[PDB]
Symmetry: C2
């Protein structure tokens, strides 16, 4: 099922009502805009072109959480469209307000802010760079020690998105000090945390030799080889993939994987019922020959 | 809330399963892909990159409607992403298969085909031109005579989307003979149809002097002035808007609006409770001086 609607003098009136001193008129317009921004790129574009972004960004400073959550939601949805749409969010000045929100004692606000930064960081290298230049990395890395598993997964995802940019963007992640926190997380008894940390680490390990060498130095290899003993097949797959990425580096990084005791563990996984596990294990093992 | 997932050897496997002779395995994969394609641009991009498009396009020839409806749904969702994502749908050869579906006696398939086509025509001029070149216009124009209000609304939207492009693509719609059918639709007692028609016509009237003149020569002006008597405020709004578009042309187009007796009907509407109606009526009247 699908409804079509034309815009629309309503949309600017909607935008105009974000500055309205009537909070329920305000909230009604706000909910309406978030609903529209949750459609296609076409819909998202209509919200942008109606000039919603400056007003939405202003609301990120509100001491009213009801207003704020809905505005964050709207922004996050816009940032799930095209790169130029993500860019319009950045141009509107959303990033400094988003970063400031990373220190919120409100877990709902914090996760929504992280989720929105994540969406922005999911775009092109231009958009990723803006997040870094806005200064998100230090608060992001700090959140890696969070005892809150829900906040942790959200920070891991955003960091991973940042780390899927060019080699210089990955390096910014490494330089903000993400690697010791991640490596530590590889020691968790929580398989869900492991999958999340490996997603991010793997993105880092897919960089150039300098980025890969940093991963080696932070002691990721022993932890990765330990995970090759995991009964959980998702973990095996992520750990194999991360390792395969390291083993795609130079002779130096390859030699490091060889010295890490990975060959026995890989040789067993080569005889696995799981086809994905069988494959990545065979390949990882082959690259380091 | 929001769940994240890292792809994933599964995605190519799901793609590889579109060609599986196991129909339930095929359906399972198919439904999984469409679910993923209904996420952000990030998610849509993953489906494209996994190479689902060539396989999805093949399925558009299947005599199995269950398979076909789900593949259509999947393609339409991809076509609701960025311009280059639409482009990837076109580059995979979807358009000729879509246009052939416009002759389907199955209303479900037909509406989904139009919907997907509509999503493609919502992109840039480059994407719109490919729909035109694929030969969609003749069937679309024919559907304007359809006694099915549901099929009708879907054809109106897709044509409207085409008509939102450059003056040349608007011209292409005019040349396929859309204007007589639209003008006929302006005589409908069905206000829902009127709105849909006025959306399409208004888009055509936002073209250059050539395209505006074609609208005037199709006899829209009497019909539009008649609609300025409507008790329905949306209809008044769309008709005022369409008319304001015509009155944004050259002196000759403006002269024609004067000659069509729009003067007293506008002046009446200049004293109206509705602020949008008040405004567009006032402007239109001003342009034709
Ligand atoms: Ca108040
Ligand atoms: Ca408060
Ligand atoms: Ca709290
Ligand atoms: Ca992206
Ligand atoms: Ca039928
Ligand atoms: Ca568009
Ligand atoms: Ca009917
Ligand atoms: Ca009626």
């Amino acid at each position: 099922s699908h409804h079509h609607h034309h815009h629309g003098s309503e949309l600017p009136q909607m935008v105009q009502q974000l500055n309205s001193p009537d909070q329920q008129e305000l909230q009604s317009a706000l909910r309406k805009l978030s609903q529209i921004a949750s459609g296609g790129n076409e819909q998202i574009q209509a919200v942008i072109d109606a000039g919603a972004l400056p007003a939405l960004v202003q609301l990120l400073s509100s001491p009213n959480e009801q207003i704020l959550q809905e505005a964050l939601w709207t922004l996050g949805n816009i940032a799930s469209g095209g790169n130029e749409q993500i860019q319009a969010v950045i141009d509107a000045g959303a990033l400094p307000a988003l970063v400031q929100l990373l220190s919120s004692p409100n877990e709902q606000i914090l996760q929504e802010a992280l989720w929105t930064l994540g969406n922005i960081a999911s775009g092109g290298n231009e958009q990723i760079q803006a997040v870094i230049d806005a200064g998100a990395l230090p608060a992001l890395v700090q959140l890696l020690s969070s005892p809150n598993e829900q906040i942790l997964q959200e920070a891991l995802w955003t960091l991973g998105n940042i780390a899927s940019g060019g080699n210089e963007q990955i390096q910014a992640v490494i330089d903000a000090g993400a690697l010791p926190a991640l490596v530590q997380l590889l020691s968790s008894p929580n398989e869900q945390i492991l999958q999340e940390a490996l997603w991010t680490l793997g993105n880092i390990a897919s960089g150039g030799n300098e980025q890969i060498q940093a991963v080696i130095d932070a002691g990721a290899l022993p932890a990765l080889v330990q995970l090759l003993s995991s009964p959980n097949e998702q973990i095996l797959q992520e750990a194999l993939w991360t390792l395969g990425n390291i083993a795609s580096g130079g002779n130096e990084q390859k030699q490091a994987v060889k010295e890490a005791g990975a060959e026995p563990a890989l040789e067993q996984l080569q005889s696995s019922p799981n086809e994905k596990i069988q494959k990545e294990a065979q390949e990882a093992l082959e690259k380091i020959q």
